[PDB]
Design an enzyme around this catalytic site. Sequence first.
Site, short mmCIF file in Angstrom:
data_model
loop_
_atom_site.label_atom_id
_atom_site.label_comp_id
_atom_site.label_asym_id
_atom_site.label_seq_id
_atom_site.Cartn_x
_atom_site.Cartn_y
_atom_site.Cartn_z
N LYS A 1 -59.34 38.10 39.39
CA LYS A 1 -59.67 37.63 38.05
C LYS A 1 -58.77 36.47 37.64
O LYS A 1 -59.22 35.55 36.94
CB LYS A 1 -59.56 38.78 37.05
CG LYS A 1 -60.43 38.62 35.82
CD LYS A 1 -60.33 39.84 34.92
CE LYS A 1 -60.65 39.49 33.48
NZ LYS A 1 -62.07 39.78 33.14
N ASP A 2 -57.50 36.50 38.05
CA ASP A 2 -56.60 35.39 37.77
C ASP A 2 -56.91 34.18 38.63
O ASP A 2 -56.73 33.04 38.19
CB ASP A 2 -55.15 35.82 37.98
CG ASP A 2 -54.71 36.90 37.02
OD1 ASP A 2 -55.49 37.23 36.10
OD2 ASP A 2 -53.59 37.41 37.18
N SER B 1 -49.04 46.91 29.29
CA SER B 1 -49.74 45.80 28.68
C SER B 1 -50.51 46.28 27.45
O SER B 1 -50.44 47.44 27.05
CB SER B 1 -50.67 45.14 29.70
OG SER B 1 -49.99 44.88 30.91
N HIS C 1 -43.27 45.03 31.59
CA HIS C 1 -43.72 46.01 32.56
C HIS C 1 -43.20 47.41 32.26
O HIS C 1 -43.82 48.39 32.67
CB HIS C 1 -43.29 45.59 33.97
CG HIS C 1 -44.12 44.48 34.53
ND1 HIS C 1 -43.79 43.82 35.70
CD2 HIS C 1 -45.27 43.91 34.09
CE1 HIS C 1 -44.70 42.90 35.95
NE2 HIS C 1 -45.61 42.93 34.99
N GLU D 1 -46.62 13.70 20.50
CA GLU D 1 -47.78 14.13 21.26
C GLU D 1 -48.62 15.11 20.45
O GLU D 1 -48.20 15.62 19.40
CB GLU D 1 -47.35 14.75 22.59
CG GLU D 1 -46.98 13.74 23.66
CD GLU D 1 -48.16 13.36 24.52
OE1 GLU D 1 -49.26 13.11 23.97
OE2 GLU D 1 -48.00 13.31 25.76
#
Lengths: 379, 379, 82, 111, 49, 49, 64, 49, 241
Positions: free
Chosen positions: B227-228, B205, B201, B271
């Site tokens: 949007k998230d 970004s 922050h 896995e």
Amino acid sequence: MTNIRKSHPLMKIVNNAFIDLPAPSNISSWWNFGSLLGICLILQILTGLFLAMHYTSDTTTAFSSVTHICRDVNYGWIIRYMHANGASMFFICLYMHVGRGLYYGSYTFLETWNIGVILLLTVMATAFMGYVLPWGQMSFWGATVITNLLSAIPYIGTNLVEWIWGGFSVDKATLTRFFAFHFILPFIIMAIAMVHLLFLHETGSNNPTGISSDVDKIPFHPYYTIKDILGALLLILALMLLVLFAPDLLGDPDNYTPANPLNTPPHIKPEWYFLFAYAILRSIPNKLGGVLALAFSILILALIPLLHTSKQRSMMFRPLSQCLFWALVADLLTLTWIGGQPVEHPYITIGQLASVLYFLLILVLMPTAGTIENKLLKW
Amino acid sequence: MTNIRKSHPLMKIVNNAFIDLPAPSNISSWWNFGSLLGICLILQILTGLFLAMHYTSDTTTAFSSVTHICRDVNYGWIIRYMHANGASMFFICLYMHVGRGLYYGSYTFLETWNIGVILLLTVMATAFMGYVLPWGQMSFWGATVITNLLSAIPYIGTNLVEWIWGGFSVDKATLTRFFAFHFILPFIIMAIAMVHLLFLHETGSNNPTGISSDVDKIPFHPYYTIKDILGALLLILALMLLVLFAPDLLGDPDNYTPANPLNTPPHIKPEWYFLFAYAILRSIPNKLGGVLALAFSILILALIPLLHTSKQRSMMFRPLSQCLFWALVADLLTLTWIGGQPVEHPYITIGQLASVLYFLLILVLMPTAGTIENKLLKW
Amino acid sequence: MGRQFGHLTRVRHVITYSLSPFEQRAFPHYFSKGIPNVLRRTRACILRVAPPFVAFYLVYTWGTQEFEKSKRKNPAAYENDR
Amino acid sequence: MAGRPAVSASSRWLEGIRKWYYNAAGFNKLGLMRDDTIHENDDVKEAIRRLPENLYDDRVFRIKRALDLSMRQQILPKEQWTKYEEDKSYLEPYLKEVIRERKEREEWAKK
Amino acid sequence: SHTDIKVPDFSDYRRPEVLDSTKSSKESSEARKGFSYLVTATTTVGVAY
Amino acid sequence: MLTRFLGPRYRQLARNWVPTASLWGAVGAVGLVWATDWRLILDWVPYIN
Amino acid sequence: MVAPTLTARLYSLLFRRTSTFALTIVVGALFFERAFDQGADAIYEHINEGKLWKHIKHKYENKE
Amino acid sequence: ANAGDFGGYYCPCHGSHYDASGRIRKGPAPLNLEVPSYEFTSDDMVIVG
Amino acid sequence: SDLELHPPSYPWSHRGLLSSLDHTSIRRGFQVYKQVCSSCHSMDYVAYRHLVGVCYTEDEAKALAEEVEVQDGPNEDGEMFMRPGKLSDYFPKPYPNPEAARAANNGALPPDLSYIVRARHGGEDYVFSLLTGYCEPPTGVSLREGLYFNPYFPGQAIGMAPPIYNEVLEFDDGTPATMSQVAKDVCTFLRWAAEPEHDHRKRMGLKMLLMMGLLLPLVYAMKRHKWSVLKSRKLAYRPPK
Ligand code: HEC
Ligand code: HEM
Ligand code: HEM
Ligand code: HEM
Ligand code: HEM
Ligand code: FES
């Protein structure tokens, strides 16, 4: 000191609260308990995590795993006892943290004080489920009476008790849930403790005088880090004295027999830091009244900031309130003494009188004490 | 009373990073995996805590407790599978979070990127430790081969292998330690993830363009929260699709038989999210080389920011590097495909070539790709 | 945290003097004036601290005494005789 | 508290108890006047801001030296204590106006 | 009028060697700091154990 | 509640925000009833009977 | 701590430079820990002479 | 179990062939097969150590 | 009767803050267990390997373990089979289940002796007084069959025949096996069986006191040295005119 230090957009500035934070000079020794509480918290997590690497929650192999920890694990005996006696140090430090706020009027920090009560409730909850983990006829029965108190609530009391129990009574289902809950709750306390400091750094500490200390602030790093380190050693000395010289001095001997639901211990009682709460609940024959008084006494802390009356803030210059404060501390010790004793005729009278005085002092006498002195100071 | 000057002297000022934070407008869907990763943590912890209320770490009653969770606990079958498939969704989301940084040059955020690798290492440790918890002949034997790799370390291998094992081999001692370790590590990830955002922050970004987006920042609250939320639903849809329609599609069938140290599974393999690393280790016949290549491939992420050559940040306007990026992704899929196959003559040749290409691309071809285009653009 | 040295308060016309920690004794007049100090401090608080806890001991010394007396049997064997 | 000066006294007069309580409070032993120990709320803080420079600067040093006394857990000599009769309210006139201002402001939003 | 200021008497807390105003303070500077650091070195030694 | 003192200005303030507080308790009532299918309450709705 | 004293040479030789300050902390820990264990243990045997296993172990294993 | 070619022992996962004494005939195995300490007190009992 | 009697505070060789257990008494204390207690009292948390380095040598304890046969799980044919015990084996259980134990006695269930020192109020003092406190019931007390009067037992009626008497066993070293002497050894053993860490507990305790008794004055010196600046600090107020 080497450069202009450049940089700065990192987590170091968050650490300025530990180095360059202004602090009052006259901060007494009753304040290391703030840092001691953090020392106690990370000590329980450190020893608890290594305890959880050999502890199994199944009832068939819960108590036997505790014996395996002490008898078989290399140096596993000490870790169990700094964990058992650390909680004693936790609540020793917890009760002085509350007491200092009562005396020095630290509850005027409404945000910090309210988060402090939440922290108190979380630890008392956390320490309750930890006692049930060894599963030792005091774990089973200590959890039996306390959890059954929730049955006094109407329309949810029976429903939530079974929901808490995971069945019809305390059993393997309850034991596994407690160990998982006992694992996560301490990490919640760390987050709240950081939030607890966040509401305090906005306004700073609270000098024992009670007046603003903005005129005489000092850097934290050279003066209080070395003061807290000395306080930490006094905690380690006190904790280690129990562990290495009287490990079972505080714990009840009956906890060393495996839990038996068909057999009842001669005297059923919680740990010493809940004994004062037990006395208040046992003072009322009613069941619904007892559970409410048990919760009200713990939750009365949030009501303290709304009861301030004195024009001064700390009890330093309030001799009338000082006499009441140590009467409350003595009464809180009487409640602890009553809780560890069976319910007979010499203690029902003493228990009821001590409990009725515990609420009377804070609700009536203390606010009246502040009003009386206001007249004596012409304001 | 200023509505904008909200309850600021509280924790909301920290929450301004979620509401009023400036964010680039041209953020694509590949950025949604940052918020998805946080949801994966919360989902894994939520289901994990309720799983820990019925799981018992003792070897004699570890596998049988997992069966009791599905067969007996009300709605306990789904929780076990959102946990088993949430890890699948975690590493699906984790690998695209890394891939976006590779493509869009987000590793230029040196502080955030380095903490990202630490976050990656912590999850793969947690996922590996949690796979051993069911104790089902894939847990015992998957942990056997991987943990025994540490014996290749010179002069300290066997010393720490036993110290990991708590004995001479994987047994009940190791199982209890893993469950306690599997409980604590996810709460560490939350703390590191908060630090991960703290180093981002401050520098903002990134955008698919790769240029500074300070000229076209938009508020986060009305545009990206919705949007998230849409991105979250696509995660819940994808995770729930596995859980409700193919719960064992990704997990190996052999894990449903109780662990037997005397019997080996027909094929040993971790896995699906570790199969890409298994192939690299299996490429080199040497033991010390294999463990180093296993660690180097995971730890090569920290070396990526030091290999940047192009004068452009993102790969949006770098067609030569785009051809190499999807060659690396395809090769990473080849490593995943060949990881789950037995070591025979077709996969021995392909395994070495895919592994030697995995390091050759990032170490040599990609830096040479940036140099070639730099010459091609008059700079 | 929005508060540091520089803007705490306005202090005017106050001069302070201090010594280097290496030029002064760490424990100066420890028992010469510290012991007479603690006597002064204790007296200033013994009239507000001791009485509340003195009462508790009186409760202790009587609440426990009565408890044993209850457990002790009393001579109430009359009205039955031989 | 301790035995009252007269013989033992339950409640005699009014000035005697106030004088006895002043020495009992003990803020004079630190060289502080009565209004140097008041709680600083949003009202008192404004009434401090209206203090004259000579009076405000005097208050700062009295607090500054008191914290030095509290830091060492000491008190001023017997001759340097704040005499009860010589104690004067340097903040009461300023508090009263802020009391008057706030009551008028509050009642204006009520009527 | 600033020349009226005079540093108060610190001889009550002064170390015995720096008590004399005539004798230089550099003679004992090595040992004054040596004793104080000896306490720190011995404390870390105990904590290290 | 929703006020500060006892005055005509606050009395008008309380009355003006009663209908919203009136229907806000419905969410607390119905929503809690909806969450745990409060039977005594779910026994009166015709379609959910 | 005065003119020609032990501490003056102790500070200048070691504590003058912080690099050598840490050396005496780690090297001092080596020699302190070895002497402290033997010093503190030897007291324990004196308090418990003829009590622990090692004080009666000689009675068995072909030694008696 | 005894289903081998040059010693009867074969590793079914990746491939490793051992002789009677455990010598590696094939497979990427760096070190030979383990051999425990040998001692005897009775002709009918053994202790692996 | 339903009344309580306070056990006397018997002096012990391990009653001090730094005093350790008398390992000679532990060796004799076990002889009481393997001959008297083990008949109907269980100890399922102490192994035959625990006695190594405490009261018996490795060869001595191996002989003790092999003296008793125990079960060794399923045979090749899936059946139980007896075998001589090993060091890793725990002390033999007199009965398989508590129901058998209540059947062997008059309903009373013998408590496990592993923690009986730390699971009773008074510790070894109560146990020593309980073992030697047997006396004829006072006039006015009637006891049912299988019940014996012991004032130190809560309730004064215990389902215990007197387990210790003079010359009940024979000690290896030749000490007289008197009524009081035998009780002292088993009480010393029952403490070790409950707190095997007892010796190391004090051994680290003495090291702490010497360690902390030196650091506490030293750490205080650093606190005073750093704070000596503020303690010796003079304030002067020099306002204008
Ligand atoms: C005759 C079989 C038998 C013998 C031999 C025996 N016990 Fe017990 N023991 C019992 C029974 C039965 C009880 C339970 C009595 C009761 O609960 O009323 C018991 C209880 C006890 C208790 C519990 C007392 C309490 O207040 O909880 C102790 C301690 C004890 N035994 C110690 C010993 C010791 C030491 C020896 C060896 C000297 C021994 N016992 C030998 C059968 C035996
Ligand atoms: C504030 C934090 C904690 C408090 C106050 C606390 C308190 C307690 C208490 C009072 C007991 C009872 C022990 C006894 O009476 O014998 C206990 C037991 C236990 N605790 Fe905690 N605990 C805390 C954190 C933790 C953590 C973080 C873990 C694991 C990661 C843990 C694991 C255990 C275990 C396994 C036991 C049972 C083993 C034993 O009792 O020795 N505890 N705890
Ligand atoms: C694990 C539990 C807790 C931790 C770790 C913790 C931590 C701290 C710390 C480190 C401080 C600052 C130190 C200081 O000023 O002395 C502080 C301040 C404070 N805490 Fe807590 N605390 C806890 C529980 C509580 C409780 C139970 C209360 C009950 C009232 C409380 C109320 C306060 C208050 C009022 C302050 C103000 C300090 C001041 O006046 O300067 N906290 N807390
Ligand atoms: C990032 C966090 C986590 C990851 C990636 C993770 C991953 C895994 C994985 C892959 C398994 C294997 C399940 C299977 O193959 O059947 C597992 C099992 C398990 N995990 Fe976690 N886990 C996480 C956090 C937690 C937490 C926080 C807890 C407890 C509070 C927990 C408790 C368990 C339990 C009890 C099991 C065994 C039950 C089962 O396998 O269904 N996990 N975990
Ligand atoms: C549990 C694991 C992780 C969590 C919860 C997490 C969380 C986040 C979030 C929420 C963001 C901002 C979202 C966005 O900008 O799209 C972010 C940014 C970032 N993270 Fe992580 N992360 C995790 C692991 C990783 C990993 C494995 C890497 C590997 C490189 C990494 C490197 C980065 C980078 C480079 C950014 C820059 C974003 C940008 O350029 O805008 N993180 N992280
Ligand atoms: S063949 Fe299975 S590990 Fe070698």
